[PDB]
Amino acid sequence: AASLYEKKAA
Amino acid sequence: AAASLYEKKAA
Amino acid sequence: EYMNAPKKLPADVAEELATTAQKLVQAGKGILAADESTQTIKKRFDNIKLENTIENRASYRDLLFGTKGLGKFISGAILFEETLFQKNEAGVPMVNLLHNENIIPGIKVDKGLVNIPCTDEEKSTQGLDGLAERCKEYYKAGARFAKWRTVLVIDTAKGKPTDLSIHETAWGLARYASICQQNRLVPIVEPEILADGPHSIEVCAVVTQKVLSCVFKALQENGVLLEGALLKPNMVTAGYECTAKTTTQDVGFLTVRTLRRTVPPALPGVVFLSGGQSEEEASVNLNSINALGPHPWALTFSYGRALQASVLNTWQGKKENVAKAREVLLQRAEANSLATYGKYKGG
Amino acid sequence: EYMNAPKKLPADVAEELATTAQKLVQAGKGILAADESTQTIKKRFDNIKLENTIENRASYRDLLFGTKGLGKFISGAILFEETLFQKNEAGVPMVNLLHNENIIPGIKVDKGLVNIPCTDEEKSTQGLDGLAERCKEYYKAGARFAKWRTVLVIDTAKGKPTDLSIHETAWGLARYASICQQNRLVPIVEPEILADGPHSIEVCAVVTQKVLSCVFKALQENGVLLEGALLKPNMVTAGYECTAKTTTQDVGFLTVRTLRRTVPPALPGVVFLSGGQSEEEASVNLNSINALGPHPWALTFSYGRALQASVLNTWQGKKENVAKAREVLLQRAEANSLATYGKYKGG
Amino acid sequence: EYMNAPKKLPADVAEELATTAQKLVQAGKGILAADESTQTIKKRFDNIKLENTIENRASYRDLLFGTKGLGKFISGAILFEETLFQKNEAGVPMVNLLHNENIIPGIKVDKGLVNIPCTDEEKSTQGLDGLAERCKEYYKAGARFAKWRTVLVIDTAKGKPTDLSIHETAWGLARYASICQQNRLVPIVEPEILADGPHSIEVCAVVTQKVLSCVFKALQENGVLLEGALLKPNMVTAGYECTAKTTTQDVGFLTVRTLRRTVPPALPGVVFLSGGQSEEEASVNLNSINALGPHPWALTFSYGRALQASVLNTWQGKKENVAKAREVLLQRAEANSLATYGKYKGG
Amino acid sequence: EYMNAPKKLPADVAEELATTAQKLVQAGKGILAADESTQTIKKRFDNIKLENTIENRASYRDLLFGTKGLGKFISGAILFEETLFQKNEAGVPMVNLLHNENIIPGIKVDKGLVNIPCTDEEKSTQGLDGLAERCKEYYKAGARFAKWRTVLVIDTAKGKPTDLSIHETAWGLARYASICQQNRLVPIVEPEILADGPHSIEVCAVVTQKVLSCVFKALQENGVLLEGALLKPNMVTAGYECTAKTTTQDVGFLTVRTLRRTVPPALPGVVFLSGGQSEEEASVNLNSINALGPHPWALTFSYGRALQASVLNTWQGKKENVAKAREVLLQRAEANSLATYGKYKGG
Ligand SMILES: O=C(N/N=C/c1ccc(Cl)cc1Cl)c1ccc(O)c(O)c1
Ligand SMILES: O=C(N/N=C/c1ccc(Cl)cc1Cl)c1ccc(O)c(O)c1
Ligand SMILES: O=C(N/N=C/c1ccc(Cl)cc1Cl)c1ccc(O)c(O)c1
Ligand SMILES: O=C(N/N=C\c1ccc(Cl)cc1Cl)c1ccc(O)c(O)c1
């Protein structure tokens, strides 16, 4: 759904 | 310059 | 050393700008605004039915600057770019005529007005591009100060002047001032607020104060040396179409009040523009301002209409009217000179 | 009406504020800052070896305000919340002692300093909550002017004071000022810049100028009436640990220059803080400032350390030394009073 | 290091704020706003003729928080300070009923609204004094996120909201949030613009954009972690007394467009306030907002009126209606949960 | 109407600008920066030992734009003023070469850089004077988007970039963007921060975040439609002389974080500049950025060095190497195209 950044963020 | 006519008719 | 701040000017330059600024606003003397563009001076020549040629423009400027005794009432004369490199019939440069009366040459350095997008025809001033280069050749030609005209409009219904109009005017002025001072030109900051409209004199004071607060803020942010600068504001008056009658006392009080609240004492002087006021009313209002006691800065004038309206009517583009026109000029020159003392009367 | 601009105060309120503010900085008079908090007053009592009790604070404040002839050199007295509602040993209200000498009672309305997040221990001033209600409370108790202390630090290597620190102080001072003016209280704006560090007097001038520019900008945006307010800044001096020594003439010039560049003449007076300066240097420096000719505003003092340091040492909490200490107060009050005229010479 | 910039938060603290911020806006979840003051909750008991006592307030919050299965739709619950330390008639802490349902406790931390001087009754929010101390105590009480309500009014004729109203609101919000993040509390920034007036929905879109642009600018200057923060704005709608008919799609479009122009993707979520909208209007409008494709942030809800209105009438202040009222809460909680998916279609 | 806010753009104009902006950042496509000035393109021809004539400049740009199949990877190409009105050998205008390859013509409208007074050689961009007139000229010539390059320097020791530098940059870009949108041109906002210096990558992130915050702030105050605009910033990288080794994922992480914290989703895309990066590293870093999942905006490229460096070396001003160099252009265009999908392997 969201970007990979958001997934790795928190 | 702290005693002008403007100041004498203000405060 | 505190880095996050505008750096100082070189000592030799700052001292020269400060000296020139003081000289431009010396006691009993004002500035002659004769920097009418080719398109504007055409309007003035049409009222006297005179052809707008280079020959007549030179002849008219020769009439003004060639007037003996003018230097006693005039400390500076603002020129258009054409006039700056212009000569009369005798081949004598116009600048040299100013030097003979010890009148300091000045140059209009802005490129006129353009509309600001996303606003209701609110204006922006052009002239920043290549300004430094022009300042160098203007200084070489004899100019020791410059001017940059900006325009704001009061329309309370449309919220004029808007925030965008104010800050663009303010930042544009500050940008021009720092450039001029870098090239040893004393900048005359002109945030003219038009008197067109039915707004009261109270509204004009509120607007003028808000505008001037934003202008000087922009000046400090750009590192403009206030000691080597001059302010060219409008007189706080009611609108041209305002119903509420206001005498010259109302103009004087609300103008001085506005100036005391926003202009730092470091500013050597403030030159009032005549605007659309008549020659006599411009002198009376200026007199009423200086009648309100001594001021921390010099409150003199930088007139154009109030010094040339009757001169043109007397001249009518005729050689045999030069003498009569030059004496009318001296009359208006001395009239406004007395106004700065607060000692000018009608007759 | 222009609408998008701060409204004006009622004619009655604005007139009273202007009168009080002008009377606070009257010729040859200054303000006694005796508004030390319960915590601050303790470490001053510890130096003279005295318990910080309710009686001792009352007895000491009674000594200051009971001094006959103090009104000759003192126009206003800033009090802490406690002292404002206090009575002496004879059951006589402290505010009445000031009334007898006709010294205007003042009140500290801020609630100390807290750390600004995401900064290096840069301070924010609290006290806005319920400020309007306390101002009404203080006014009925006898207050006619208030104060609000803010602190800035000069650290060139760390970029102090940062932007966040500057406009947080500025907006806080602006908010506090408009609230006090709305409640008939003359606000004393104090953007105190600490003299801690090895920075030169030139750096301080640059920093102070930048701060005052933003301080007054915030005041305008909040519609603070400059005619009914007072500025309490630091003297432009070098840091305590600065190597390049600066004489008092350097302090005087760069202080005046900074004020003339930023402070509008509408502001009636500027009351300098003593800071970490000794009692003698605070008098000498103040004298050097006023020795630079007549100023657009009044340049007097709002001292505490430079008026109470020798008084405490003379008193030492003893009932016997009351009269002896009061003569010390008048001596240091006259010394600073003469400094306002620029006629104080230590020798 | 750049120095002249707001410092970073400690890694551990900023991390907790981020994950908490993520949990509050979980997919299909929102926030229950039960932080009514004891006066605001009074007018709700006046519609069901119930005594405004601590007992009735306890039983009511117990009805809301004691609801099983509520955690599937509710991610967080905003509380008043009273309820945070309050116990039910059975003696079980209110904060524990939330923990059992995996609902994150929240706290309203502002001290109400006060008038801004020189404005036409424009509101300023108080609560900065001792805010850091209260946040530490709230965190130890179970609260993980806070709330700060500000109010702006749209009146085009009076130029509302004015710049002073907008900036004071923005700077106040930024001040509160930086303190909350410092004290491990996720700040909910609420720049609520009232829907009062006859203004069109286009006007609301313009104002909201201007406000949000000023709000988020203040957050950056205060160095507030957007990753660990929430926005609680109003839905872009026309005024109540407006005459220009608009559908829920108009509300949906001009709300999304406004947020896309102003709100950075770093902000994990946006919790809309129900305002004066009815229970059905708030759900349909939220559905229309999410029906416009996937968004960079979570566009969910922080409702109070839209969740508790039908619950109050169903309860009628009776124990036998508790079971019946809690199901009404679930029905409406799920209704808005489906709206976040953009799949809610009542009928 | 709120009045005190930037007025809306005409529906037709705003509609076209939004289309062009999104089309320039179409999936897998990027922008070719071939708008080198005369003195700029000279230093390129000197490296491959080639005389800087008008024939060679025409021949070289003909090689680029005449590349069959370039439209698959290039959405738009930025031209210099000369190139826009130029024709190749065959007689075909350079504009028509772009039209046949589905490439949108772009134009550089800035007049170069000029030092800001009272700063340490911090630059300001000129080109506002007569910009609106040139935009109308460029549009009729075939241009559909414009570019304006501003330069900031990171020097923490000297506090660079200073507030004056940042705000002049921001306001300059702000004015430019509004004028272009007024005249049906999509503005490419380029606040380039130089990677020159030993500063770490963390410092660059903080500075870039601060600059972008001020840039967009200035953008919204002049009322620039973000939907019809593009951003051309530098990648968040460590300094060129920095010692702390940073991987390509460190570049990608701190770049995405910086953009998400500052850039509103209304902006259709962001076109990075290659800067001093090598061709390969410019592709690897762009890939690392896009490898972090689908972003709210299109994060593509506006390269010139990264697309033309190897082309010039292959061509060497000889006709026999044109097709050979055009293939080099295509493989670099495809490399950065795959980088937009995050599907670009090292080799
Ligand atoms: O609270 C005051 N001074 N406390 C200073 C201080 C104490 C201790 C530490 Cl650690 C730091 C600091 Cl800055 C004060 C309050 C009102 C006044 O009029 C005034 O002149 C001073
Ligand atoms: O409703 C609230 N305040 N009262 C508003 C109000 C004013 C005037 C009239 Cl006539 C009616 C009403 Cl309801 C309120 C209180 C706390 C919150 O966190 C919140 O979101 C809302
Ligand atoms: O002309 C450009 N740059 N001038 C570079 C330059 C010139 C002179 C000196 Cl001394 C140093 C330098 Cl770095 C230019 C043109 C188009 C672009 O898209 C762009 O990013 C830059
Ligand atoms: O030639 C000028 N054009 N300025 C605009 C202008 C002129 C005349 C009328 Cl009626 C209106 C307008 Cl907007 C000019 C006029 C006065 C100055 O002080 C100056 O430096 C230039």
Author numbering:
A (entry chain E): 7 to 16
B (entry chain G): 6 to 16
C (entry chain B), D (entry chain C), E (entry chain D), F (entry chain A): 5 to 351
Manuscript excerpt for this entry:
Herewith, the bridging enzyme PfAldolase, which binds actin in addition to its role in glycolysis, plays a key role: it connects the actin/myosin motor to trans-membrane adhesins of the thrombospondin-related anonymous protein (TRAP) family, which are expressed in a life-cycle stage specific manner. The cleavage reaction leaves the extracellular TRAP domains bound to the host cell or substrate, while the cytoplasmic C-termini, also referred to as TRAP-tails, remain bound to PfAldolase, from which they are believed to dissociate and be recycled for degradation over time. TRAP is a competitive inhibitor of PfAldolase as the binding sites of the glycolytic substrate fructose 1,6-bisphosphate (F16BP) and TRAP partially overlap.
